[PDB]
Write a protein that binds this ligand. Sequence first.
Ligand SMILES: [Cl-]
Ligand SMILES: [Mg+2]
Lengths: 15, 15, 15, 15, 15, 15, 15, 15
Amino acid sequence: DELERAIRELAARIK
Amino acid sequence: DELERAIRELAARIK
Amino acid sequence: DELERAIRELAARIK
Amino acid sequence: DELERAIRELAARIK
Amino acid sequence: DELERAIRELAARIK
Amino acid sequence: DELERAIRELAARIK
Amino acid sequence: DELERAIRELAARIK
Amino acid sequence: DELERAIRELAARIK
Ligand SMILES: [Cl-]
Ligand SMILES: [Mg+2]
C-alpha cells in the first residue's frame, strides 16, 4: 500500500 | 509501529 | 520524541 | 489541547 | 486563539 | 493565508 | 513550496 | 493521491 509506505517514511523521519 | 499506528489513525480521520 | 509523543497523544484522544 | 500541541511540535521540526 | 496561532506558526515554518 | 486556511480545514477534520 | 501545495491540494480534496 | 503525497512532502521537510 502506498499510503502505508508513506506513513512508514514519515514515522522514520520523525523518530 | 505505535507512532505509525497513530499517524494512520489521524490520516483515516482526515480522509 | 516530542513530536512523536504529541502525535501519539492526539491519536489516543481522537479514538 | 492535544491538537494545538501536535501542530506546534510539528512546526518545530519543519526545516 | 491558541489554535489559530499554532496554525499561523506552522504555515510560517512551512513557507 | 491560503495555507493557514487549508491547515485550518484539516485541523477541523481531525477535531 | 512543495509541502505547501501538497497541503492546499489535500484540503481542497477533503474539506 | 493527495493524502499520501502530503505525508511524503511532510516527511521530506522533517529535520
Ligand atoms: Cl517507499
Ligand atoms: Mg509537488
